[PDB]
Amino acid sequence: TGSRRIFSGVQPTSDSLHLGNALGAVAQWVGLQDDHDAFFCVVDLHAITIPQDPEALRRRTLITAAQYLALGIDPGRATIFVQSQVPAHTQLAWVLGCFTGFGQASRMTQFKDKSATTVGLFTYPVLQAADVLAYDTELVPVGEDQRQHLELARDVAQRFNSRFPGTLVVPDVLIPKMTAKIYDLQDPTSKMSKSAGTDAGLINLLDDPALSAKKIRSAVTDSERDIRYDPDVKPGVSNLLNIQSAVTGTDIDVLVDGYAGHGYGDLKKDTAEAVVEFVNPIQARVDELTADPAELEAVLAAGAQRAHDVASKTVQRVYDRLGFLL
Amino acid sequence: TGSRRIFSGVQPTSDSLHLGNALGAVAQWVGLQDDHDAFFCVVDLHAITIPQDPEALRRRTLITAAQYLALGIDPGRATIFVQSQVPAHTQLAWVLGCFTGFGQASRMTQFKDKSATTVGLFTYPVLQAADVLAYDTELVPVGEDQRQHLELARDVAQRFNSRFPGTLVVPDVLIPKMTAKIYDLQDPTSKMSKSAGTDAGLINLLDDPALSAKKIRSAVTDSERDIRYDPDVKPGVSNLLNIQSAVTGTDIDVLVDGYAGHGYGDLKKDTAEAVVEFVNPIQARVDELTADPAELEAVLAAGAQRAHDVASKTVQRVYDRLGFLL
Numbered sequence: 001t002g003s004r005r006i007f008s009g010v011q012p013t014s015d016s017l018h019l020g021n022a023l024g025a026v027a028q029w030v031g032l033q034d035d036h037d038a039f040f041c042v043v044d045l046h047a048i049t050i051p052q053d054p055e056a057l058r059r060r061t062l063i064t065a066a067q068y069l070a071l072g073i074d075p076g077r078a079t080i081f082v083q084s085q086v087p088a089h090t091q092l093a094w095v096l097g098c099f100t101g102f103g104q105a106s107r108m109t110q111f112k113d114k115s116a117t118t119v120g121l122f123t124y125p126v127l128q129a130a131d132v133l134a135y136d137t138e139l140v141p142v143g144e145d146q147r148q149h150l151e152l153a154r155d156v157a158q159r160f161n162s163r164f165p166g167t168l169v170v171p172d173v174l175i176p177k178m179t180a181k182i183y184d185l186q187d188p189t190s191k192m193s194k195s196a197g198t199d200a201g202l203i204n205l206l207d208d209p210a211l212s213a214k215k216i217r218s219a220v221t222d223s224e225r226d227i228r229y230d231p232d233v234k235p236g237v238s239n240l241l242n243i244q245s246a247v248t249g250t251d252i253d254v255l256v257d258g259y260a261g262h263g264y265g266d267l268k269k270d271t272a273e274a275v276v277e278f279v280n281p282i283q284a285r286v287d288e289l290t291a292d293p294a295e296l297e298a299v300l301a302a303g304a305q306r307a308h309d310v311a312s313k314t315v316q317r318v319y320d321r322l323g324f325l326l
Numbered sequence: 327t328g329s330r331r332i333f334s335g336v337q338p339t340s341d342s343l344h345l346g347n348a349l350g351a352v353a354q355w356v357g358l359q360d361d362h363d364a365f366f367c368v369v370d371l372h373a374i375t376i377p378q379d380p381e382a383l384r385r386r387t388l389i390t391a392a393q394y395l396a397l398g399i400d401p402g403r404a405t406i407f408v409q410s411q412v413p414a415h416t417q418l419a420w421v422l423g424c425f426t427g428f429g430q431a432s433r434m435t436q437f438k439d440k441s442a443t444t445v446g447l448f449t450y451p452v453l454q455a456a457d458v459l460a461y462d463t464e465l466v467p468v469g470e471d472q473r474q475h476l477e478l479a480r481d482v483a484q485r486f487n488s489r490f491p492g493t494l495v496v497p498d499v500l501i502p503k504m505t506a507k508i509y510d511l512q513d514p515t516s517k518m519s520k521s522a523g524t525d526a527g528l529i530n531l532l533d534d535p536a537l538s539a540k541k542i543r544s545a546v547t548d549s550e551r552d553i554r555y556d557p558d559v560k561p562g563v564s565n566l567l568n569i570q571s572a573v574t575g576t577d578i579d580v581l582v583d584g585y586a587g588h589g590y591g592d593l594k595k596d597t598a599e600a601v602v603e604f605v606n607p608i609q610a611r612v613d614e615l616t617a618d619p620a621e622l623e624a625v626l627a628a629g630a631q632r633a634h635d636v637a638s639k640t641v642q643r644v645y646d647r648l649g650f651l652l
């Protein structure tokens with residue numbers, strides 16, 4: 001159909017998604033794609049807010065699409081496409097920036113975090129708003145770190161509609177609970193990110209499974225020697241249970257009860273072993289999709305045509321409302 | 327041909343161009359269009375950096391195109407088109423913003439002038455750079471007030487080419503001399519602009535000719551009672567001679583010599599009378615083009631197709647260089 005419209009995206013900024021991308025975003029997408037009209041985007045225009053190697057940016061664009069498919073995104077149910085192939089994104093982004101307070105974009109966390117900012121680092125939340133609003137998106141499945149961004153997208157949509165009623169769908173932010181943050185393994189306070197310097201706390205989907213298992217087995221826990229889920233008091237330990245729960249389907253309580261009398265060594269064992277079991281089918285699927293790119297680029301080609309059909313209607317509806325000559 | 331490529335634009339922010347637009351920009355375009363490949367744009371995407379009435383924005387978009395034709399732009403020689411109908415502008419603008427220093431865009435005069443800025447008020451110089459660079463533009467005919475903007479366009483083009491040699495043409499800024507500033511008549515210090523509050527110092531092309539002549543006859547001169555061209559010491563008086571010279575074809579020296587023994591009353595007489603003679607053929611042409619819009623919208627339609635053919639090649643060349651999957 002075209003109801004319960006969903007939109008979400010990941011940047012092709014690296015050679016692998018990490019567990020946070022896969023559990024905190026892409027896993028939700030796979031549940032949702034059955035009964036939602038879903039658009040899943042590789043957002044390459046966002047990638048170049050930071051300098052990118054061209055051969056790498058292209059290779060990583062395809063690899064990010066491939067990890068979508070290997071994680072279960074289904075091209076028969078959903079639409080996968082590359083942001084830069086749909087001009088409507090930047091068109092709407094220009095418009096939306098005209099309804100976006102400068103201070104409103106200054107107070108955005110990553111701009112506070114730096115401010116050698118560029119205009120692109122400053123305005124990318126506006127382009128993110130156009131990414132979502134261009135597809136009449138009803139819900140946006142993202143992790144917790146994307147919430148402030150999408151309240152800007154909602155506010156600008158409401159500011160625009162106040163002048164032009166009924167023009168843009170105001171999206172609901174759909175954020176998970178536990179998996180909403182997979183934490184670094186060497187620092188279970190901050191999120192597992194591609195920006196914490198060392199890959200040591202970072203579990204990449206496509207890394208060497210024995211290497212990821214080694215990082216898990218080396219994870220920072222605490223001293224209580226009690227396996228119990230409490231993210232404040234037990235950062236490392238709750239993260240690992242969160243990880244093991246997410247890649248297995250077992251609730252955390254059923255896990256914590258099965259861990260009565262067990263130690264933290266047993267906890268890392270099983271989590272590593274389940275992660276390895278999780279990533280190996282992914283890597284096999286990714287390897288074939290990289291070696292046989294017909295499938296993957298047909299998907300992207302069908303996705304881009306479908307995205308353009310939708311997104312360009314939105315842009316002309318906006319343009320008409322603004323008074324542009326069409 | 328396709329050599330000596332020219333690009334320039336005016337915002338459809340009002341119901342009339344004023345003498346500054348017509349003498350400081352559009353008159354240069356008409357001289358240039360004979361031996362230059364020229365693209366002349368109605369830049370409506372810039373207009374909405376400030377709230378615009380939709381019925382007015384559309385009507386003024388066409389009226390600005392029409393004043394181009396009534397001032398002598400020739401659709402057989404040049405290309406006239408509406409900015410918003412060519413998606414490449416915002417596409418390139420997103421890219422260029424990633425190569426544009428935040429401080430570099432902060433130091434831009436109009437942002438200093440305000441800073442309730444929006445993102446659009448902050449980033450419009452970047453979109454202006456994409457407007458020009460998207461057409462492999464060799465020269466940009468503009469008045470003196472657009473110089474700081476186009477040094478940003480040149481710098482960003484050079485910053486981009488440093489990473490990707492040979493990708494973007496670096497445009498030369500082509501600025502006139504005398505007409506490079508037509509001044510307000512009630513304040514011959516500052517430029518005649520649509521933003522000085524009172525239309526009283528403002529000569530609109532399409533205003534009532536007797537009203538414009540009245541404003542001229544009421545112009546602030548000085549006390550020397552000597553007709554001589556010196557813009558510092560003689561602000562009002564040099565402006566009027568500048569105006570009369572520009573709308574007649576007579577050099578200022580030939581004028582000043584013919585004004586030996588004459589007073590300032592005679593100076594306003596002739597300038598008003600020559601302006602009236604200038605604007606009446608314009609208004610007749612504009613009136614027909616508004617009443618018979620077939621011609622005008624065929625021009626814009628041919629222009630937009632030609633602009634898209636050029637501008638989209640630039641964008642794909644840029645995208646390829648960046649490493650986007652095409």
Ligand SMILES: Nc1ncnc2c1ncn2[C@@H]1O[C@H](COP(=O)(O)OP(=O)(O)OP(=O)(O)O)[C@@H](O)[C@H]1O
Pocket residue numbers: 008009010011013019020021023024025141142143144145146179180181182183191192193194195
């Ligand atoms: N540690 C994490 N836990 C859960 N979700 C995450 C995590 N990191 C990112 N996400 C989610 O992944 C999606 C895309 O994130 P993004 O592409 O910015 O990756 P990232 O890990 O933040 O990389 P980068 O440091 O390059 O920004 C969003 O829905 C975001 O909420």
Ligand SMILES: Nc1ncnc2c1ncn2[C@@H]1O[C@H](COP(=O)(O)OP(=O)(O)OP(=O)(O)O)[C@@H](O)[C@H]1O
Pocket residue numbers: 334335336337339345346347349350351467468469470471472505506507508509517518519520521
């Ligand atoms: N007073 C002026 N004298 C000479 N050229 C001018 C003058 N004002 C604008 N121009 C030229 O007209 C072109 C477009 O100007 P623009 O569309 O910004 O008009 P404007 O008069 O500045 O109106 P606004 O106040 O809405 O910006 C540019 O090439 C600019 O240099």
Ligand SMILES: CNC1=NC(=O)[C@H]([C@H](C)c2c[nH]c3cccc(C)c23)O1
Pocket residue numbers: 007008009010011043046047049124127128131132140142146
């Ligand atoms: C640097 N650019 C950027 N950093 C982010 O955190 C967002 C994000 C990747 C993003 C861009 N477009 C989107 C559309 C829907 C959902 C999301 C998460 C996004 O963009």
Ligand SMILES: CNC1=NC(=O)[C@H]([C@H](C)c2c[nH]c3cccc(C)c23)O1
Pocket residue numbers: 333334335336337369372373375450453454457458466468472
């Ligand atoms: C608010 N926007 C804006 N204020 C300006 O002064 C420029 C200008 C109208 C502009 C936009 N695009 C252009 C391309 C070529 C030449 C010029 C003069 C322009 O834009």
Ligand SMILES: [Mg+2]
Pocket residue numbers: none
């Ligand atoms: Mg991020």
Ligand SMILES: [Mg+2]
Pocket residue numbers: none
């Ligand atoms: Mg201006």
